[PDB]
Amino acid sequence: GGEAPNQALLRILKETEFKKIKVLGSGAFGTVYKGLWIPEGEKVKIPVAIKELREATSPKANKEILDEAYVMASVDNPHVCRLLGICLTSTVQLITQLMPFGCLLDYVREHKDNIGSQYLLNWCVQIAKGMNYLEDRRLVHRDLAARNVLVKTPQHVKITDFGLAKLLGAEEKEYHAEGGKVPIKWMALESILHRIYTHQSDVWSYGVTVWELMTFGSKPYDGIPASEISSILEKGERLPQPPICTIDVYMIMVKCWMIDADSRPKFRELIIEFSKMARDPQRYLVIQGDERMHLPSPTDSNFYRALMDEEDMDDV
Ligand SMILES: CCC(=O)Nc1cc(Nc2nccc(-c3cn(C)c4ccccc34)n2)c(OC)cc1N(C)CCN(C)C
């Protein structure tokens, strides 16, 4: 069919309504703070991440963050990052749901001794659900990676970073890029060679992300530099089977790395397979002391008065 009106609402927030509390990170993206958003007179406090950029002076900083805002305002799914609004101060700030446990790559690196097979398989299920939703929305992410998955709780993760995301027209079936830095080691071969991006190249990146999780955050092709990756992949070489993975799981990864993009799994099928595996996790991932491992959860604690606060439960 054809092209439906995007009737998403973009909400403009007054800077009055949110209190920054701590800086979380800074660098190329700008500076991300954690804070509280209090819509006036509604008796709620919503933990948020506020992304400023370095300078009000660069018009393509503003253009890039506004494109990110367009994309994020157009998605609504429990496993995709939740955009709350933008504030049009001198520095244009993007306000999203605070994800207290950080990015998933560093989370697995930091907690590898406490991560059982249940958590890993559930994360794969949830990531596949988010990506299948994005495919439903005809959105190609183009930067799926463990660093670009955020952790609301150990039981709940969401896909983030839509800085390279592209929405396809209904008649479009692929996006053709024109230069610009791209993460080679997560990229499908046809993306590396012809700058072609599809939902199936996103499937390739999903495979690499799963490899990251199953190795507890190892760097893919650790030694190799990016220029060699193309011919490495052309020779037929792929990432190795992680120690904890049965052949059942590794075969799924390998299918994600097929050269024929149409022979790769579709995201709905990855949902199905990984949930089947999640129903008997120790049969598909072999982790020592798996049975005794447990992970944290919130117990109502931060630096403030917080009787009036919550997060995903603030609709409209
Ligand atoms: C820097 C890695 C990281 O994720 N840090 C982190 C993030 C959040 N929260 C959160 N929520 C939504 C968005 C973001 C976010 C989005 N962008 C684009 C960002 C860029 C830089 C930093 C954060 C964000 N961050 C957090 O919440 C309390 C705590 C932490 N840490 C201090 C734990 C870090 N760990 C490795 C030791």
Ligand SMILES: [Ca+2]
């Ligand atoms: Ca509200």
